[PDB]
Amino acid sequence: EYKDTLNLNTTTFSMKGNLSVNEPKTYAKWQEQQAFKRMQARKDNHGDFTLHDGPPYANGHLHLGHALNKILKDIVVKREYFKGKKIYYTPGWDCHGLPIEQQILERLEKEKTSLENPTLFREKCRDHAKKFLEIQKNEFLQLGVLGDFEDPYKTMDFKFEASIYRALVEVAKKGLLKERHKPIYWSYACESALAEAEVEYKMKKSPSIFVAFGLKKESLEKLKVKKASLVIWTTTPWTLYANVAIALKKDAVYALTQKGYLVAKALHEKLAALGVVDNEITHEFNSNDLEYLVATNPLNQRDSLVALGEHVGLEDGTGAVHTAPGHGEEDYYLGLRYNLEVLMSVDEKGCYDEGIIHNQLLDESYLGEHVFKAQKRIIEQLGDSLLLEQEIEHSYPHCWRTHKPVIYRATTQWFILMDEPFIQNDGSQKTLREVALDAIEKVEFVPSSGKNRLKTMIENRPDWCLSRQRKWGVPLAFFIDKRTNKPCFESEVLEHVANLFEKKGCDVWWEYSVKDLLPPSYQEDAKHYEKIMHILDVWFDSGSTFKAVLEDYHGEKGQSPSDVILEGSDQHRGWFQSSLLIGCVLNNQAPFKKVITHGFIVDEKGEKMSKSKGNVVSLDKLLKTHGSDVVRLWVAFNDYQNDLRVSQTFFTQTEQHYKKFRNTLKFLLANFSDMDLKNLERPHNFSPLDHFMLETLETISAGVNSAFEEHDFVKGLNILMAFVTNELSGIYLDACKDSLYCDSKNNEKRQAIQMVLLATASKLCYFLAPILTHTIEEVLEHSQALRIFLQAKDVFDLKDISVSEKLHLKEFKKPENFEAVLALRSAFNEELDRLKKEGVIKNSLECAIEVKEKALDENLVEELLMVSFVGIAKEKLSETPAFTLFKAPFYKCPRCWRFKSELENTPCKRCEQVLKER
Numbered sequence: 021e022y023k024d025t026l027n028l029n030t031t032t033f034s035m036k037g038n039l040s041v042n043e044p045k046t047y048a049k050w051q052e053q054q055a056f057k058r059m060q061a062r063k064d065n066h067g068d069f070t071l072h073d074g075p076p077y078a079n080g081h082l083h084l085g086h087a088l089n090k091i092l093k094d095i096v097v098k099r100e101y102f103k104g105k106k107i108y109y110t111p112g113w114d115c116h117g118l119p120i121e122q123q124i125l126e127r128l129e130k131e132k133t134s135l136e137n138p139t140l141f142r143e144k145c146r147d148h149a150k151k152f153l154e155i156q157k158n159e160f161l162q163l164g165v166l167g168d169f170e171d172p173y174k175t176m177d178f179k180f181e182a183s184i185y186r187a188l189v190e191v192a193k194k195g196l197l198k199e200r201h202k203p204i205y206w207s208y209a210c211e212s213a214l215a216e217a218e219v220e221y222k223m224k225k226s227p228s229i230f231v232a233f234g235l236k237k238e239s240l241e242k243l244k245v246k247k248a249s250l251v252i253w254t255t256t257p258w259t260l261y262a263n264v265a266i267a268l269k270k271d272a273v274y275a276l277t278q279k280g281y282l283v284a285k286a287l288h289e290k291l292a293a294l295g296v297v298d299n300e301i302t303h304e305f306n307s308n309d310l311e312y313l314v315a316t317n318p319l320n321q322r323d324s325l326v327a328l329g330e331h332v333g334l335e336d337g338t339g340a341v342h343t344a345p346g347h348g349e350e351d352y353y354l355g356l357r358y359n360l361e362v363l364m365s366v367d368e369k370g371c372y373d374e375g376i377i378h379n380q381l382l383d384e385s386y387l388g389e390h391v392f393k394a395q396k397r398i399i400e401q402l403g404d405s406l407l408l409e410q411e412i413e414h415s416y417p418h419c420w421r422t423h424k425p426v427i428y429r430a431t432t433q434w435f436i437l438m439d440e441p442f443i444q445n446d447g448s449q450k451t452l453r454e455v456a457l458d459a460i461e462k463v464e465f466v467p468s469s470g471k472n473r474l475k476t477m478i479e480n481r482p483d484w485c486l487s488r489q490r491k492w493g494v495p496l497a498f499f500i501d502k503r504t505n506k507p508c509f510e511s512e513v514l515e516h517v518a519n520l521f522e523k524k525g526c527d528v529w530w531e532y533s534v535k536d537l538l539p540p541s542y543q544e545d546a547k548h549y550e551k552i553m554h555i556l557d558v559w560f561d562s563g564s565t566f567k568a569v570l571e572d573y574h575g576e577k578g579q580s581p582s583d584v585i586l587e588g589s590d591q592h593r594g595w596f597q598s599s600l601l602i603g604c605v606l607n608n609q610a611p612f613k614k615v616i617t618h619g620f621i622v623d624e625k626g627e628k629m630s631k632s633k634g635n636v637v638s639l640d641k642l643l644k645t646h647g648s649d650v651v652r653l654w655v656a657f658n659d660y661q662n663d664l665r666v667s668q669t670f671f672t673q674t675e676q677h678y679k680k681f682r683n684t685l686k687f688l689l690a691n692f693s694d695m696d697l698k699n700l701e702r703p704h705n706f707s708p709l710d711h712f713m714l715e716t717l718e719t720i721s722a723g724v725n726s727a728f729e730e731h732d733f734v735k736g737l738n739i740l741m742a743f744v745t746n747e748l749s750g751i752y753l754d755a756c757k758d759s760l761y762c763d764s765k766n767n768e769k770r771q772a773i774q775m776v777l778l779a780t781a782s783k784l785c786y787f788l789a790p791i792l793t794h795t796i797e798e799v800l801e802h803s804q805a806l807r808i809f810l811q812a813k814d815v816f817d818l819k820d821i822s823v824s825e826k827l828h829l830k831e832f833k834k835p836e837n838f839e840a841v842l843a844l845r846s847a848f849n850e851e852l853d854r855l856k857k858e859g860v861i862k863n864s865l866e867c868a869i870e871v872k873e874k875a876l877d878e879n880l881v882e883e884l885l886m887v888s889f890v891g892i893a894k895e896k897l898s899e900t901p902a903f904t905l906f907k908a909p910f911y912k913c914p915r916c917w918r919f920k921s922e923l924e925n926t927p928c929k930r931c932e933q934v935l936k937e938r
């Protein structure tokens with residue numbers, strides 16, 4: 021056998037990734053060697069790119085959605101680095117808020133204990149955030165991501181707390197921070213007000229009742245009827261105690277039935293079909309003539325004013341709306357328009373308090389009962405006034421961290437106003453809603469559809485309630501002047517508190533006296549001031565990160581506005597919106613130039629993962645099973661703008677993609693491993709097939725790059741994979757295998773092939789480096805030729821090379837046109853496939869071909885079809901309009917296995933000379 025006389029063509033680069041063992045070593049080296057700092061220090065940086073990290077909550081281990089997020093950020097950041105830019109990417113953690121505090125409260129409950137000291141309670145929350153920040157940081161690094169993880173930002177840093185407070189101060193000084201009294205979301209489980217981002221709408225079952233309020237005797241006399249009762253529909257019997265009015269649609273017809281029920285005429289047919297009221301209408305009245313009549317509450321016998329409500333709907337209900345100003349925002353405004361009582365006797369824990377006794381609103385037995393528990397007994401107490409009881413299902417607001425349904429309570433809270441004109445930085449006058457809508461139009465959204473998701477929210481959102489009644493967060497640290505009952509926004513007071521926060525953190529707001537928290541020129545008047553003890557919405561904390569990270573560090577951690585932020589599409593309701601709003605107050609523009617969103621990680625069926633459903637796949641399990649480079653390729657090679665399903669089949673497909681990339685890289689490294697590096701300095705004469713491959717490589721490289729610039733990594737990876745599978749493996753490597761293994765190492769044509777393979781390996785490395793960074797690091801570690809060719813110590817020295825310059829190509833060389841010869845190749849292979857079926861031949865090398873069209877390079881035909889002979893032979897096998905196939909009129913060469921030998925078992929002329937070489 022002559023196998024030992026072939027070129028060895030091997031590389032130390034292994035076919036097996038052994039990713040579970042090798043990736044941790046790579047990532048630990050990048051940490052020890054400070055690779056990100058090295059990236060930022062790269063001397064030839066040209067241009068800047070800032071990605072501003074949206075901070076995860078510092079609670080719990082990372083979930084799969086965190087990995088998706090940081091991997092996508094890493095690909096985007098690494099692309100910009102390898103394009104040559106100085107990168108800014110400081111990851112951060114969201115350390116305050118119910119996401120941390122609720123965990124402490126649940127632990128205290130489970131341990132059967134309490135912690136009432138505010139400093140010690142906050143210390144427990146702060147230690148909890150410190151613990152999981154370190155856990156999450158190290159779990160991020162296990163993904164192979166690069167950023168300033170050894171100097172991340174933290175909302176609990178004292179300087180950061182001061183930054184958040186200084187952001188709040190800017191909002192106050194521009195006149196947008198005001199107190200309001202009105203019903204808002206109230207979570208009784210954590211005894212706190214909430215705003216929209218802290219509410220999760222879920223389906224919930226509820227009573228649904230139709231209740232008769234009888235008109236008082238004097239109102240019946242005014243209306244000239246013997247019996248009349250307005251029927252209301254409500255899903256909240258627990259607010260009936262607080263009824264003050266029944267609101268009707270203005271200028272609308274109301275039908276009185278024979279049994280004496282008064283409902284909107286437009287709803288009578290539906291209501292009679294339900295059995296709420298009887299079918300016979302006796303009289304019709306205009307609601308304008310019913311206004312200021314009075315009815316009687318059947319629950320507590322109190323008066324109820326018949327009023328006219330703006331936008332009373334006739335789609336559902338009865339057209340008569342039970343109005344409780346203490347527990348509904350539109351009810352509140354109507355009560356004020358009619359100067360009615362605001363009845364609100366539900367405490368911070370959602371229980372009826374002594375106000376139901378003092379005001380005669382509800383029987384004393386209900387004192388202390390939770391409003392939701394009391395509803396069944398309230399419904400029974402309604403007696404004959406209850407015309408119909410149903411149970412319905414509806415989407416209902418729940419607290420984001422306690423998961424309990426919220427209620428609504430009239431309360432005094434602090435708000436950022438949306439429709440209050442304020443002075444713009446350029447001197448003009450606009451409302452916050454107007455500025456934010458203008459700002460959104462200047463932001464690039466990827467996908468574009470995200471723009472209108474955020475725009476619709478800004479169009480419809482109410483004033484933003486900022487004040488919370490928990491302890492773990494930044495306080496709304498203003499004083500109330502008792503002489504004025506107004507807050508003190510004097511700059512000397514606010515800057516004094518801000519400076520204290522920067523040096524000592526916000527604990528002092530609880531510990532110091534009012535006098536110790538005031539400037540020395542105010543301390544004799546300290547008796548007139550009281551502290552506001554509410555803390556800020558944690559969404560204000562995170563909406564302020566642009567100011568605390570980008571602006572307060574003066575560009576050292578990135579520019580404001582950032583170039584890119586990248587988060588789940590659920591951040592339209594969260595971080596995108598709060599950052600937009602705060603940036604529009606401070607700067608009158610969004611603090612980001614571009615928003616890229618991704619979907620959720622879901623299970624095999626497309627459902628969200630939760631321990632309740634038992635479908636959770638841990639990040640640790642996924643990484644140990646597949647390796648991080650496979651998980652990273654799974655992300656990049658899929659439609660990450662939508663939900664990504666975790667299933668064995670999809671990860672097996674990704675592993676097959678990774679194997680094809682890795683096997684291709686291994687073949688390349690193996691087949692230029694023996695090349696004399698003196699080749700790199702001299703020009704080469706490339707064949708037409710060589711040139712076709714170089715020109716194809718340039719064409720697909722432009723396509724991969726354009727797709728990756730759009731963040732369409734699927735499109736670019738499909739282009740790359742098709743090139744690797746078809747032109748590279750299917751055509752070029754197949755055609756080149758004979759020369760690579762059987763030609764002399766000194767053969768000039770073989771050396772030119774190796775140069776093409778080096779150029780191809782180089783482009784594969786550049787384009788895969790952002791995604792498969794560990795693997796390309798390993799490629800360079802095993803190929804001295806690649807490192808010298810690219811002038812690269814390691815993966816962080818990669819640049820986009822000019823193949824033309826490195827291979828000394830001539831500028832006006834006319835591109836190859838292989839359309840005719842590739843059409844012949846495809847037709848030959850189909851004919852060859854048929855002959856292999858019949859058993860006529862086993863291989864293309866056994867064949868000779870005579871091509872009808874003599875306008876084709878015959879060496880190229882032989883190369884591309886891998887026949888052993890182009891021309892006429894003696895034993896005809898088949899004929900087409902395009903060619904005739906014969907058995908090759910030679911023996912198989914024992915060394916190269918081509919049918920080119922004149923004598924049996926004797927090396928062909930090429931092999932003979934290679935074997936004799938001195």
Ligand SMILES: CC(C)[C@H](N)C(=O)O
Pocket residue numbers: 074075076077114562587594595
């Ligand atoms: C600010 C935002 C990213 C928030 N901490 C979250 O994890 O949803």
Ligand SMILES: [Zn+2]
Pocket residue numbers: 913914915916917918920927928929930931932
């Ligand atoms: Zn041979």
